[PDB]
Design a protein around this ligand. Structure first.
Ligand code: CLA
Ligand code: CLA
Ligand code: CLA
Ligand code: CLA
Ligand code: CLA
Ligand code: A1EB1
Ligand code: A86
Ligand code: A86
Ligand code: KC2
Ligand code: KC2
Ligand code: DD6
Lengths: 134, 179, 236, 194, 210
């Protein structure tokens, strides 16, 4: 959840400002932009994430099934191309940092989502409206 | 303070600090004072030489300061404050930004910092590109450092004289009334 | 040549004044080269500056009076008399033809190339000046071995200083250095009188005025060559 | 830091490693080798990008037609702003340009068997792809000292070039970013492939 | 073969070895320095030979030196007057230029084929092979006279007198290359060779044969 939401917060803040050039159905408000955008885009995204989850958790989709092997660690899906984990001195720092930033990002994404629900405007537009003249 | 350069024969071969400002200064504070003194000397020497060359009817740069905005070096004014005001704001911005990048590079790139056990007011980044004082003897180099400090202090006095002559109508005796 | 050798030469040149060197140029390392290399470069530069000024002082003196050649340059017909009537010697120069200027300049470049060539200097019997060689040397244009021979060399065309003694020749190189310094000051005085009027008090009203840039070898008439019209317009 | 023996320490940062945030201390020597390889790739691509950007702005272009089917020519592509040229290129042309670049990348990862991340990697080294780097043997005349100097020059020029290409591509869209007032060419700062 | 500095000293003692690009120490196609040096030397010799040949041809044919043969039966299009030599080549019919290029292609093909191994692979640069014995080529019932010394005026000279000729060939070829490029630059760009001749203002890309 922390990884998903710390992708999601950056996506949320940067979708207000930047667009894919000529992408159909853009709206700075991502809530409205979900409906505005083509359904096939979101369908393909969900399909790709389903493939990723299935292949990464093959035969390990359940509490009893997963973590049967002792070497399996929580969150260690083997994703480390740059091999930061080979340096064991910084592994504790990076693990704690992942955990804390994921937690802050879950909270932050909830904040952005519900603030856009409240205001109807995108994140930094609402932030400016808060920090505007009386 | 008694071991630093800058003292000359013109003050009894002795230090000039009437108001005790060096007595409340540690090694780091004295290094900061020397760095500030030298940088002020450098800036004031360049400033006073430029002001004298411009306002003394000296040669000006050939063409257009801004070919698009339409400002010739001759039309700038040949008067210090007026010329600086007439310089485009973009030109002033990029001059100050280049100087700021140089200052940050100076602070971050001269190791043993002048406030952590380094020579005060030396810039290996900007000095003698070609060859000039990379082969001089350690006594003539000290003599020329003393000369630098002396005529730099004189340049401080001169540039603030020009500023006072500009603002106060006729404050300097032997300077014009339209500085 | 060490600074001791420079001092000895200065003493031989001017016994009263002696070695004057307020500049650091003899102390710096030019292009990251050594002390000997720097001193050789400065000494050869002094000698060449001298020699060129000595030659050009006589040229200015003779052409300003008018001793122009009786023959004619370009076949269509603009005699050396017409180039002389163009004005004073700088006016005569910048009124010369483009190809005449280029031929003079590129022959001088050829001579400079042969002067700095290792083979020609070695054949004449001396090394390059920045690499432990006698400054002021110009090699023979005979021993270099052009495919078609050359009758006479540049220095010693007919061997007037042939034989002699090397002590004598060094004593006359002292004369060369002093005369070259004086000639450089003299020609710069002439050209200053030509451009800035009243700049040389003795020669005020005696040297013809001039407006072109003496440091511009080509003129507006030579704008056909690339990047010259704009440079004439961009002259300071 | 781990980036001490690595070449790249310059004259403008003293002669010490410039790692204010300590990323070189993060991760493994394999991670630092990846960082060095990415630095040199961004360097090289930025030099190429700035040269191509200057070519596009100058308008110098190849003589001929990009595609005889669509009829688009180098001149018609040159009429647009530098970033719009990529949009103007034919789709199959972009596809095969990216195919060539991908093949080069794949061979760089594959045929250079002592890998940059692996031990004895030589992260900047892409020679080994025979006749890819320096086909004319221009670097053969040099020695180790001049080769090290030229590698440092590569690194400096490339860092400056990536700053420069970012600057020119962001100047017009973000006015007042680069202070020099000149008509930087219009168009997006970022473009998608195809 | 000849070492680079030795060859340069023999060619011009004043210049000696000169290679700012460092192509003598290059590795073209990853074939090795010896092979690539042989390639460079043979390329220099070929360029020089072609330049001498083309320079004598240029001076000959620019003064309207048309062969006595009528050539084309309707009309020799390039023998017409008011024609710079590049325009004569352009005015030649396409079949003529095509046949010329196939002939030069046969010559180049046989030059590459007949070698000790190759000029790259430890062979003398610039050595055109003896044409084959007799009948070992399609047709060729009699023989093909060698492109070098068809009448065999090559045993006349001695080994050192051939080395001298080789060095003179290289230097003359460099001069001829510069001369032809001077001629063409003067034709296309007037006054580019101010100290050279004044040729007609021919305006056509010489690098387009057809
Ligand atoms: C930027 C200004 C500046 C600074 C930072 C310094 C710094 C220094 N000077 Mg000073 N100096 C200056 C300008 C400055 N000078 C000028 C213009 C002159 C010419 C009159 C002199 C003449 C001078 C002499 C003759 C000597 C020094 C010396 C010194 C050193 C020891 C005294 C001290 O602690 O001063 C600290 C000074 C300051 C923190 C500046 C205070 C400014 C006050 C508050 C206002 C000035 C009044 C008015 C507007 C002018 C120190 C490195 C001594 C030295 O080199 O000892 C080795 C020494 O003998 N200076
Ligand atoms: C404090 C330093 C300083 C400042 C703020 C200025 C400011 C100015 N100078 Mg400059 N100038 C300076 C030093 C300075 N100068 C020096 C030391 C000289 C040598 C005498 C000149 C020579 C000079 C000329 C000839 C001209 C100006 C002019 C100008 C104006 C346009 C900008 C320019 O060309 O800058 C150029 C600044 C430099 C080359 C100094 C760089 C110093 C080191 C290397 C850093 C502006 C008012 C123009 C003018 O007269 O407008 C009325 C003009 O044409 N200046
Ligand atoms: C994306 C390109 C890139 C990359 C991958 C690197 C990588 C590296 N640089 Mg850096 N560098 C770059 C661009 C880059 N540089 C630029 C443009 C400059 C400014 C001109 C520098 C200037 C510089 C210096 C002066 C030095 C290095 C050094 C290093 C090494 C150690 C620091 C480190 O671990 O950084 C890892 C960094 C990253 C993985 C990139 C993170 C980028 C963030 C996320 C975004 C930045 C956005 C920006 C603010 C806009 C490492 C190989 C040191 C070296 O070579 O030591 C021998 C060294 O001394 N670099
Ligand atoms: C020497 C060249 C140069 C100069 C003079 C400027 C000048 C400017 N740039 Mg910059 N810029 C440059 C190169 C340059 N840029 C390059 C190469 C790039 C591309 C990477 C950019 C990208 C860029 C952007 C994206 C933006 C600017 C902007 C600005 C303005 C910054 C004003 C400011 O706050 O100063 C900074 C002054 C300081 C003293 C701060 C330096 C010290 C550090 C940062 C303090 C510590 C920070 C910490 C968090 C607290 C000004 C017009 C802004 C703009 O458009 O304004 C109108 C802007 O948004 N520039
Ligand atoms: C190299 C080169 C090239 C590309 C050409 C090309 C041409 N020459 Mg040739 N030519 C060359 C060298 C070259 N020549 C040399 C070295 C000479 C002797 C000095 C001649 C003397 C020559 C004459 C006298 C004539 C040509 C002509 C021609 C044309 C027909 C081909 C021919 O007759 O071959 C020539 C083959 C030879 C063995 C000679 C063509 C434009 C004809 C022409 O003018 O057509 C426009 C023509 O009449 N050429
Ligand atoms: C400034 C540049 C200078 C360098 C270039 C240069 O000088 O260009 C000069 C140039 C053009 C020109 C210019 C000018 C207008 C004339 C002058 C101007 O000059 C200035 C301004 O300065 C400009 C310039 C240079 O452009 C052109 C040069 C052309 C050249 C050099 C042409 C050689 C053909 C030889 C042939 C066909 C021999 C066949 C020989 C054969 C077939 C043999 O029998 C070989 C032989 O071995 C055999 C088999 C057996 C042995 O027993 C010995 C012999 C020998 C018998
Ligand atoms: C302005 C004011 O108020 O005051 C002044 C200041 C001001 C402006 C500076 C003035 C000036 C101009 C000055 C002073 C100009 C100075 C000019 C100077 C001093 C010019 C020397 C040339 C020597 C040459 C060409 C010799 C060649 C000699 C050679 C190559 C030889 O043949 C000699 C030879 O012996 C050798 C070497 C070998 C022997 O085997 C024999 C031979 C014969 C072959 C004025 C006019 O005074 C006014
Ligand atoms: C201050 C302000 O406001 O604005 C300023 C700053 C700001 C904004 C950043 C600006 C910008 C953009 C900038 C500065 C852009 C910089 C771009 C840069 C620095 C681009 C390098 C390319 C290098 C290449 C392609 C080299 C290839 C070289 C190759 C492939 C070689 O073969 C090299 C070679 O050595 C070998 C390997 C072997 C030798 O045998 C032969 C040679 C020598 C040939 C402005 C607006 O312009 C100006
Ligand atoms: C020391 C400081 C300094 C540096 C290091 C520096 C470097 C560069 C570089 C290379 C890195 C480039 C490529 C470049 C380009 C331009 N500079 Mg700049 N420049 C400096 C100072 C000034 C000043 C004072 C002015 C100025 C200007 C312009 C104009 C505008 C032309 C026009 O609009 O006609 C252009 C194109 C003028 C201006 O913006 O006037 C509105 C102006 O007054 N620059 N400048
Ligand atoms: C990485 C660089 C690169 C390589 C190595 C490479 C190699 C080959 C080979 C040999 C292996 C062949 C046989 C071949 C043939 C064609 N190439 Mg191609 N090509 C490259 C780049 C581009 C670009 C940029 C374009 C392009 C095109 C065409 C068209 C036109 C078709 C048309 O009429 O539409 C044809 C026939 C254009 C295009 O695809 O246009 C839609 C176009 O813009 N190519 N190309
Ligand atoms: C502990 C920890 C960490 C942490 C943390 C942090 C910073 C956590 C932060 C949590 C945070 C900031 C949680 C906010 C909740 C807000 C809510 C529920 C608001 C509801 C708001 C509601 C229901 C509003 C309703 C109304 O508007 C409506 C709809 C209409 C109006 O008429 C009436 C009102 C106004 C009432 C690290 C450092 C990240 C890692 C470490 O390892 C572990």
């Amino acid at each position: 959840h922390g990884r998903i939401c710390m992708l999601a917060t950056v996506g949320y803040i940067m979708q207000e400002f930047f667009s894919l050039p000529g992408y159909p159905g853009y709206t700075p408000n991502p809530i409205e932009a979900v409906s505005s955008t083509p359904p096939e885009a979101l369908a393909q995204i969900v399909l790709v994430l389903s493939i990723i989850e299935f292949n990464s958790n093959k035969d390990k989709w359940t509490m009893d099934t997963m973590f049967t092997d002792p070497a399996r660690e929580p969150g260690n899906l083997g994703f480390d191309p740059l091999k930061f984990g080979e340096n064991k001195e910084t592994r504790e720092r990076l693990a704690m940092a992942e955990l804390k930033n994921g937690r802050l990002a879950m909270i932050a994404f909830s904040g952005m989502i519900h603030q856009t629900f409240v205001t109807g405007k995108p994140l930094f537009a609402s932030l400016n409206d808060i920090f505007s003249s009386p | 303070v008694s071991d630093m350069e800058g003292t000359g024969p013109e003050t009894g071969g002795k230090v000039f600090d009437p108001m005790g400002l060096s007595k409340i200064a540690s090694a780091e504070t004295l290094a900061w004072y020397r760095a500030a003194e030298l940088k002020h000397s450098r800036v004031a020497m360049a400033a006073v030489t430029g002001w004298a060359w411009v306002s003394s009817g000296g040669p000006l740069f050939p063409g257009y300061l801004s070919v698009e905005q339409g400002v010739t070096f001759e039309s700038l004014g040949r008067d210090g404050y007026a010329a600086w005001a007439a310089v485009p704001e973009a030109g002033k911005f990029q001059i100050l930004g280049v100087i700021g990048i140089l200052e940050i590079l100076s602070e971050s790139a001269v190791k043993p910092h002048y406030m952590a056990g380094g020579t005060p007011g030396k810039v290996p980044l900007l000095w003698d590109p070609l060859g000039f004082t990379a082969k001089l003897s350690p006594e003539t180099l000290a003599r020329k450092r003393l000369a630098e400090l002396k005529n730099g202090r004189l340049a401080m006095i001169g540039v603030m004289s020009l500023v006072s002559a500009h603002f106060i109508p006729n404050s300097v005796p032997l300077l014009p009334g339209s500085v | 040549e060490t600074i001791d050798d420079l001092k000895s030469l200065a003493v031989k040149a001017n016994p009263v004044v002696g070695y004057w060197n307020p500049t650091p140029l003899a102390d710096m390392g030019f292009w990251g080269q050594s002390q000997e290399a720097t001193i050789g470069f400065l000494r050869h530069a002094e000698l060449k500056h001298g020699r060129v000024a000595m030659a050009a002082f006589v040229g200015f003196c003779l052409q300003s009076n008018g001793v122009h050649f009786p023959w004619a340059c370009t076949l269509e017909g603009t005699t050396f008399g017409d180039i002389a009537a163009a004005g004073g010697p700088a006016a005569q120069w910048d009124a010369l033809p483009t190809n005449a200027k280029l031929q003079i300049l590129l022959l001088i470049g050829f001579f400079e190339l042969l002067s700095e060539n290792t083979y020609a200097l070695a054949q004449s019997g001396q090394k390059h000046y920045m690499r432990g060689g006698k400054p002021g040397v110009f090699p023979s244009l005979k021993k270099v071995g052009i495919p078609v021979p050359v009758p006479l060399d540049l220095w010693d065309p007919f061997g007037f200083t042939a034989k002699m003694s090397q002590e004598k020749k060094d004593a006359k190189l002292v004369t060369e250095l002093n005369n070259g310094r004086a000639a450089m000051l003299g020609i710069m005085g002439f050209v200053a009188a030509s451009k800035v009027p009243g700049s040389v008090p003795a020669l005020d009203g005696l040297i013809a005025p001039y407006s072109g840039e003496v440091m511009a070898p080509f003129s507006a008439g030579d704008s056909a060559l690339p990047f010259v019209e704009g440079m004439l317009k961009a002259s300071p | 830091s781990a980036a001490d023996g690595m070449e790249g320490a310059a004259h403008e940062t003293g002669f010490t490693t410039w790692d204010p945030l300590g990323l070189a201390d993060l991760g493994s020597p394999a991670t630092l080798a990846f960082f060095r390889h990415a630095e040199l790739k961004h360097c090289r691509v930025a030099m190429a990008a700035f040269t191509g950007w200057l070519v596009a702005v100058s308008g110098v272009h190849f003589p001929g037609l990009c595609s005889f089917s669509e009829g688009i020519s180098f001149e018609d592509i040159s009429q647009l702003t530098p970033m719009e040229q990529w949009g103007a290129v034919p789709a199959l042309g972009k596809a095969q340009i990216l195919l060539a670049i991908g093949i080069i990348e794949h061979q760089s990862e594959w045929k250079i068997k002592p890998h940059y991340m692996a031990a004895g990697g030589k992260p900047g080294d892409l020679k080994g792809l025979k006749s890819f780097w320096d086909p004319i043997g221009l670097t053969s005349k040099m020695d180790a000292k001049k080769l090290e100097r030229q590698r440092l020059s590569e690194i400096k020029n490339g860092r400056l070039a990536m700053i420069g290409i970012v600057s020119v591509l962001i100047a017009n869209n973000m006015p007042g970013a680069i202070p020099l007032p000149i008509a930087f060419p219009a168009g997006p700062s970022l473009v998608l492939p195809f | 073969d000849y070492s680079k500095e030795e060859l340069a000293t023999a060619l011009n003692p004043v210049v000696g070895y000169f290679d700012p690009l460092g192509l003598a120490t290059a590795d073209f196609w990853s074939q090795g320095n010896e092979a690539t040096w042989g390639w460079l030397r043979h390329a220099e010799i070929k360029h020089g030979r072609v330049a001498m040949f083309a320079f004598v041809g240029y001076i000959a044919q620019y003064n309207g030196l048309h062969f006595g043969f009528p050539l084309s039966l309707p009309e020799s299009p390039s023998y017409a007057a008011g024609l710079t030599p590049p325009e004569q080549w352009d005015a030649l019919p396409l079949l003529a230029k095509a046949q010329i290029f196939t002939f030069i292609g046969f010559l180049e093909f046989w030059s590459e084929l007949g070698m000790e191994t190759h000029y790259m692979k430890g062979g003398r640069p610039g050595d055109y092979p003896d044409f084959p014995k007799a009948g070992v080529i399609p047709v060729t019932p009699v023989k093909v006279f060698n492109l070098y010394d068809p009448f065999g005026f090559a045993g006349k000279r001695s080994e050192e007198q051939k080395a001298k000729g080789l060095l003179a060939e290289i230097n003359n070829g460099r001069a001829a290359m510069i001369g032809i490029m001077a001629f063409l630059a003067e034709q296309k760009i007037p006054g580019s060779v101010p100290w050279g001749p004044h040729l007609k203002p021919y305006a056509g890309e010489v690098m387009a044969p057809f």
